[PDB]
């Protein structure tokens, strides 16, 4: 339960059988045997309870797989009749972004996004049989939900764990040690993409360098130091 435990694919699942458990990433329900089996190597994670506990396996991954309610940063790679063709990651299957999927959008009023533009969006549909769909608005009300174009910044490739940790964990010091040196705008994409823009190009470059170096290092406490050495503006 509360104690997270390392686990390999094929290992025996150690949660309570009588207790109902909703299954997240890492845990696979075999279609033929109806057995609950782990399929990813990593840390097994069981949430407290509520109404049913979530069992999921946090595993090291670099390749993003679209799931609903995810905040992603894509790049427009194509224009269609009623949608944009978007790339969330190189070599991955593209994602659709409806023309209707914008605030104050009608058939007469179209969005002004071109090929090569950065878009910050929410994965609204991620069916296993269909192409994934993203959106740049509140699907309910139809108004702006903090989504849209990202202009003149710099993008940073990062592993999924780092990005998830960056968006959800508030005890993560990278944003804090960055704020200690300069003012910056940041967009966090669970697809492993981090967008950063400062007023000065120098500062944005510094942010880029320190974020990537922080990404390569497993130790969290080092960050501050790195940031220092990076904002000392060495070459």
């Amino acid at each position: 339960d509360s104690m997270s435990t390392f686990i390999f694919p094929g290992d025996s699942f150690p949660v309570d059988p009588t207790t109902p458990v909703k299954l997240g990433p890492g845990i696979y329900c075999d279609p033929n045997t109806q057995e609950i089996r782990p399929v990813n190597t990593g840390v097994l994670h069981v949430s407290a309870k509520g109404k049913v506990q979530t069992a999921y396996i946090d595993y090291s991954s670099k390749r993003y797989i679209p799931s609903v309610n995810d905040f992603v940063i894509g790049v427009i790679i194509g224009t269609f009749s009623d949608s944009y063709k978007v790339s969330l990651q190189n070599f991955s299957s593209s994602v659709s972004l409806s023309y209707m999927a914008f605030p104050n959008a009608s058939k007469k009023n179209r969005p002004t996004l071109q090929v090569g533009d950065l878009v910050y969006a929410r994965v609204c549909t991620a069916e296993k049989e269909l192409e994934a769909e993203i959106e740049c608005f509140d699907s309910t009300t139809g108004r702006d939900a903090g989504f849209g174009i990202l202009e003149d910044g710099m993008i940073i490739d990062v592993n999924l764990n780092f990005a998830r940790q960056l968006l959800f964990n508030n005890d993560f010091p990278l944003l804090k040690v960055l704020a200690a040196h300069t003012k910056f705008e940041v967009a966090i994409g669970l697809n492993g993409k981090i967008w950063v823009k400062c007023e000065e190009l120098s500062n944005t470059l510094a942010c880029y360098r320190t974020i990537m170096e922080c990404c390569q290092k497993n130790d969290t406490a080092a960050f501050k130091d790195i940031a220092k050495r990076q904002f000392k503006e060495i070459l």
Partner: protein, 299 residues
């Protein structure tokens, strides 16, 4: 398609960074990457590391028959077949590709045709036998600079390699395992080293074709991010004899001739360091091998 999707913000960012004399990895424009050359196991096995770029070369030889046209020369081939291991943008063995053909041709002109290897020293007997030396490059990780890394790997490998001693009695030859007789190195005449300059156009094409005050930016040993955004590329191969082994500016952004000359000279400045480094590392390898033998003969 397998295309690398680059965004407008990224292109503009890197280009603007070049305008403000900045490179992403913190190098100056004329700064070649720290070359890490590592030998291991048998002779002719070398690993070369330029920053994140990782290549591996394996030298080998086998007895064969000399070509009918060339009676006194041995056989030497170099293979540089890319794989998806370096990156998914590469298709498995597209030898007919632009950058593939270019790379292969540059390496071939740098090493195989420059006479860097003594081919006539490979000949065992003029009529029936000769050595067939092979240099197989394995591209492990791509962050740019594959041509240079390949050249360094191939050369270091060829110089590190040793073929088994043999002797000849007419029709027949006698080949030896290491215990029988010590192996002997190949005939290296010179050490060709390649340096690749990348050219960026900060302004518009009109300024490049019909504009004064040439603002064309040149950098050395571009990374993958830099290589993907460049408008031009030059590869210059030189040796410590101040010889231009070869030069390849196969189109791209038109550059002023004087700038290209300056590039050649700076490249020489770099190949000095690289050559001395190769020789040094080689001698250290041999010395450590000898001292190991000395540690083996007496417990």
């Amino acid at each position: 398609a397998k295309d690398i999707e680059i965004s407008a913000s990224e292109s503009k960012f890197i280009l603007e960074a070049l305008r403000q004399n900045y490179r992403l990895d913190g190098r100056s424009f004329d700064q070649f990457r720290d070359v890490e050359i590592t030998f291991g196991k048998e002779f002719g096995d070398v690993s070369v590391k330029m920053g994140n770029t990782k290549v591996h070369c394996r030298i080998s030889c086998q007895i064969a028959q000399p070509y009918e046209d060339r009676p006194f020369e041995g056989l030497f081939v170099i293979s540089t077949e890319i794989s998806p291991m370096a990156g998914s943008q590469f298709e498995n063995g597209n030898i007919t590709g632009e950058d593939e053909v270019l790379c292969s041709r540059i390496i071939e002109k740098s090493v195989r045709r420059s006479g860097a290897l003594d081919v006539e020293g490979l000949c065992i007997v003029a009529g029936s036998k000769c050595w067939a030396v092979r240099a197989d490059v394995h591209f492990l990780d791509c962050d740019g600079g594959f041509i240079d890394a390949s050249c360094i790997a191939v050369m270091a490998g060829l110089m590190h390699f040793k073929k088994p001693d043999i002797t000849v009695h007419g029709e027949q030859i006698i080949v030896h395992p290491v215990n029988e007789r010590e192996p002997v190195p190949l005939g290296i005449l010179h050490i060709p080293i390649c340096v690749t300059f990348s050219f960026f156009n900060p302004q518009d094409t009109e300024e490049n074709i019909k504009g004064e005050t040439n603002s064309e930016i040149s950098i050395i040993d571009a990374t993958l991010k830099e290589e993907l955004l460049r408008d031009g590329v030059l590869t210059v191969t030189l040796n410590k004899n101040r010889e231009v082994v070869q030069v390849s500016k196969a189109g791209g952004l038109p550059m002023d001739a004087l700038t290209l000359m300056k590039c050649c000279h700076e490249a020489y400045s770099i190949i000095e360091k690289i050559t001395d480094q190769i020789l040094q590392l080689l001698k250290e390898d041999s010395e450590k091998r000898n001292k190991y033998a000395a540690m083996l003969t007496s417990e």
